[PDB]
Design an enzyme around this catalytic site. Structure first.
Site, short mmCIF file in Angstrom:
data_model
loop_
_atom_site.label_atom_id
_atom_site.label_comp_id
_atom_site.label_asym_id
_atom_site.label_seq_id
_atom_site.Cartn_x
_atom_site.Cartn_y
_atom_site.Cartn_z
N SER A 35 -114.39 -15.27 -65.53
CA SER A 35 -114.54 -14.84 -64.12
C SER A 35 -115.88 -14.17 -63.79
O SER A 35 -116.17 -13.95 -62.61
CB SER A 35 -113.39 -13.93 -63.69
OG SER A 35 -112.23 -14.71 -63.42
N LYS A 38 -118.16 -15.67 -61.07
CA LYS A 38 -118.02 -15.30 -59.65
C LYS A 38 -119.23 -14.54 -59.15
O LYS A 38 -119.53 -14.57 -57.97
CB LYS A 38 -116.74 -14.51 -59.45
CG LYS A 38 -115.48 -15.42 -59.58
CD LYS A 38 -114.28 -14.55 -59.38
CE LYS A 38 -113.06 -15.41 -59.33
NZ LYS A 38 -112.47 -15.40 -60.64
N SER A 279 -111.00 -10.47 -58.31
CA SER A 279 -111.25 -11.67 -59.15
C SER A 279 -110.41 -12.85 -58.64
O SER A 279 -109.59 -13.41 -59.39
CB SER A 279 -110.98 -11.42 -60.64
OG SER A 279 -111.72 -12.38 -61.41
N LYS A 390 -118.38 -6.97 -62.94
CA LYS A 390 -117.37 -8.03 -62.81
C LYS A 390 -116.76 -8.36 -64.19
O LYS A 390 -117.48 -8.54 -65.17
CB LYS A 390 -118.05 -9.27 -62.25
CG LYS A 390 -117.08 -10.44 -62.00
CD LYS A 390 -116.03 -10.05 -60.93
CE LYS A 390 -114.89 -11.10 -60.86
NZ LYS A 390 -113.91 -10.88 -61.93
C1 LIG Z 1 -111.32 -14.67 -64.46
O1 LIG Z 1 -111.62 -14.50 -65.64
C2 LIG Z 1 -109.89 -15.05 -64.02
N1 LIG Z 1 -109.02 -15.24 -65.20
C3 LIG Z 1 -108.12 -16.23 -65.25
O2 LIG Z 1 -107.93 -17.03 -64.35
C4 LIG Z 1 -107.32 -16.30 -66.55
N2 LIG Z 1 -106.93 -17.70 -66.68
C5 LIG Z 1 -106.07 -15.45 -66.46
C6 LIG Z 1 -105.97 -14.27 -67.21
C7 LIG Z 1 -104.81 -13.51 -67.12
C8 LIG Z 1 -103.76 -13.90 -66.31
C9 LIG Z 1 -103.85 -15.07 -65.58
C10 LIG Z 1 -105.01 -15.84 -65.64
C11 LIG Z 1 -109.30 -13.93 -63.13
N3 LIG Z 1 -109.36 -12.56 -63.69
C12 LIG Z 1 -108.01 -12.12 -64.12
C13 LIG Z 1 -108.03 -10.61 -64.23
O3 LIG Z 1 -108.89 -10.00 -63.55
O4 LIG Z 1 -107.15 -10.10 -64.95
C14 LIG Z 1 -106.95 -12.55 -63.07
C15 LIG Z 1 -105.52 -12.65 -63.63
C16 LIG Z 1 -106.92 -11.71 -61.77
S1 LIG Z 1 -107.56 -14.19 -62.69
#
Ligand SMILES: *C(=O)[C@@H](NC(=O)[C@H](N)c1ccccc1)[C@@H]1N[C@@H](C(=O)O)C(C)(C)S1
Length: 450
Positions: A35, A38, A279, A390
């Site tokens: 993430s 972003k 995020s 971030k």
């Molecule tokens: C960025 O790294 C995003 N991560 C994901 O989409 C992972 N696939 C994920 C991790 C944990 C749970 C579900 C999905 C976003 N950042 C995460 C965070 O800040 O914890 C999120 C779950 C908000 S999505």
């Protein structure tokens, strides 16, 4: 340096405006950004679209209206607004009625021509596509294209577990789930699965152990156009507007008709703030394909988004990302690859132009908001209120990219790309001590020693 066995760290820490880093550990090595991607999406979005851009959805008429009858088609033109709600469609339909349309002698067109090709970026794991965090960020979104369901075990084991779903969600649920007695031999390796089909069909399969309470589940809509269409159809019927044709998809670019109703999102700066603080994958990825659409005047695709972001960074920000791979806006893609040194150039640009961009105030502030409200390592380093950064977060990945204000008051930019913080099955739910001790020392070091 001492993290668990097998983890991979690339790290760079550099005073704002300086030409040499204070910390440089494998900074050239390309890594999965998750993430933290972003940060790049937000910068490219502000440069291309501007802080005042708004997503737009319209109802348009093509044809003349005679005695309340539209002689022609109603077009619902979607615009990838990630914040569009069911209520919004209801209100637009109310507006359509009020303008004098009681009947459509024609078709109802669900227009997604703003985008083309797949609603899923290259490199996204298939298995997550039914989870809301990975819902396909299509042109047609309503209530984030996420719906919930309740799965109830059957009172008598062997009978089918059954699904309750709110009637307004236009999805079709089927259960092939067998309810297991307590102590079943099957409990161990019998999975509970969701299998998506066409037209927003979902089949639940496998096994569910007896439970006294229903199991709550939330799933991603796979066909946003069909879903939005069914919502529009329902709202038209409730408002008493009839039509003689059918609901059809419109995918090819076309001249707009007369706008009879519209909805615009909040300003893009506000949306990018939500995106960075929370995020939000869906905001990141709708923005990403919009950037390509805007820059090249073509229907938005993942490829056009990638090309546009690379061009914007090079041409407007002076950052040549070189062999960096950018596959999406959110960082979901396992194809994304970038070196701390490349992300550092982006961060330096942001800091240098922060009075123009108002960007740093959008990042989570350690100890206050978004993703960093309580990050143990940062809290323990004594750096709450001193780090705006971030996160990039998934199993074994603990990335961080942003800014820290140091004990001397010097602002530094930093990139921490840390992965393979994998643990052995027998400790998979505990993985914290080393990371926290590492971050606590590191950001304490950076903070006190600079
Ligand atoms: C960025 O790294 C995003 N991560 C994901 O989409 C992972 N696939 C994920 C991790 C944990 C749970 C579900 C999905 C976003 N950042 C995460 C965070 O800040 O914890 C999120 C779950 C908000 S999505």
């Amino acid at each position: 340096t001492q993290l668990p066995a097998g983890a991979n760290l690339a790290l760079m820490v550099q005073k704002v405006g300086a030409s040499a880093p204070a910390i440089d550990y494998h900074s050239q090595q390309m890594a999965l950004p998750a993430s933290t991607q972003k940060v790049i999406t937000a910068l490219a979005a502000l440069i291309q679209l501007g802080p005042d851009f708004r997503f737009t959805t319209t109802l348009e008429t093509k044809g003349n209206v005679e005695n309340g009858v539209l002689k022609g088609d109603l077009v619902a033109r979607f615009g990838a607004d990630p914040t569009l709600k069911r209520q919004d469609i209801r209100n637009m339909v109310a507006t359509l009625k009020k303008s004098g349309v009681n009947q459509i002698d024609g078709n109802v067109l669900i227009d997604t021509s703003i985008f083309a090709s797949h609603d899923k970026a290259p490199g996204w794991p298939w298995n997550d596509m039914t989870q809301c965090f990975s819902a396909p960020p299509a042109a047609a979104i309503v209530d984030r294209n996420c719906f919930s369901v309740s799965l109830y075990s059957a009172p008598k084991p062997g009978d089918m577990a059954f699904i309750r779903v709110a009637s307004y969600y236009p999805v079709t649920m089927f259960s092939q789930v067998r309810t297991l007695p307590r102590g079943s031999a099957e409990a161990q390796y019998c999975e509970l699965d969701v299998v998506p089909g066409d037209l927003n069909r979902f089949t639940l399969t496998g096994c569910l152990p007896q439970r006294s309470e229903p199991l709550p589940l939330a799933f991603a809509v796979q066909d946003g156009a069909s879903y939005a269409g069914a919502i529009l159809k329902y709202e038209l019927k409730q408002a008493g507007i009839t039509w003689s044709g059918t609901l059809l998809r419109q995918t090819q670019v076309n001249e707009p008709g007369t706008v009879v109703a519209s909805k615009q999102s909040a300003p893009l700066h506000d949306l990018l703030k939500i995106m960075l603080k929370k995020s939000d994958n869906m905001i990141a990825d709708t923005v990403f394909r919009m950037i390509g659409h805007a820059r090249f005047n073509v229907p938005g695709t993942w490829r056009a988004g990638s090309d546009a972001v690379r061009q914007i960074l090079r041409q407007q920000a002076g950052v040549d990302i070189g062999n960096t791979i950018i596959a999406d806006g959110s960082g979901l893609s396992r194809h994304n690859l970038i070196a701390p040194a490349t992300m550092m150039q982006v961060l330096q640009y942001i800091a240098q132009h922060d009075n123009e961009l108002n960007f740093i105030s959008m990042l989570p502030l350690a100890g206050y908001d978004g993703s960093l409200q309580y990050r143990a390592g940062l809290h323990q380093a004594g750096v709450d209120g001193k780090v705006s950064a971030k996160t990039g977060s998934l199993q074994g990945v603990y990335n961080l990219a942003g800014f820290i204000t140091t004990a001397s008051g010097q602002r530094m930019a930093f990139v921490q790309y840390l992965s393979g913080y994998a643990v052995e099955p027998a400790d998979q739910r505990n993985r914290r001590i080393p990371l926290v001790r590492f971050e606590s020392r590191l950001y304490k070091d950076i903070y006190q020693n600079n």
